[PDB]
């Protein structure tokens, strides 16, 4: 873990109130599960390692990083209070990709495939009970 990469997003903080909701359970069991196993998931399964990729400007451009490895930790370690927080994390991850990369770059096509799946699943996010 290089000093030239930022610290990853917070995934543990006892002072932040936590809750299980049926919607968060769906995000873990249906949404994350579906996206994680996708053929195009691998660039998104951990924070962008700008040193290893030789992208020294990455964290100059992307000031709100997010990735599915972080989201998986947040879901598995009950970090969230509600589904909107987690949906926002997914949307941040996609937008980072679209902002940093050229349209039509392979990673953008990969992100777009995952986002299409994401949208289908979120359209079916259950009513909160």
Author numbering: 40 to 168
Article sentences:
Bromodomain-containing proteins are a prominent class of epigenetic readers that recognize acetylated lysine residues, typically on histones. BRD4, a member of the bromodomain and extraterminal subfamily, which in fact contains two bromodomains, is perhaps the most widely studied family member and has been shown to be very amenable to binding druglike molecules. ATAD2 was proposed from computational druggability analysis to be less tractable than BRD4, attributed in part to it lacking the hydrophobic region present in the BRD4 ligand binding site, termed the “WPF shelf”, interactions with which are postulated to contribute significantly to ligand binding affinity. We demonstrate the utility of FragLites in mapping the binding sites of bromodomain proteins BRD4 and ATAD2 and demonstrate that FragLite mapping is comparable to a full fragment screen in identifying ligand binding sites and key interactions.
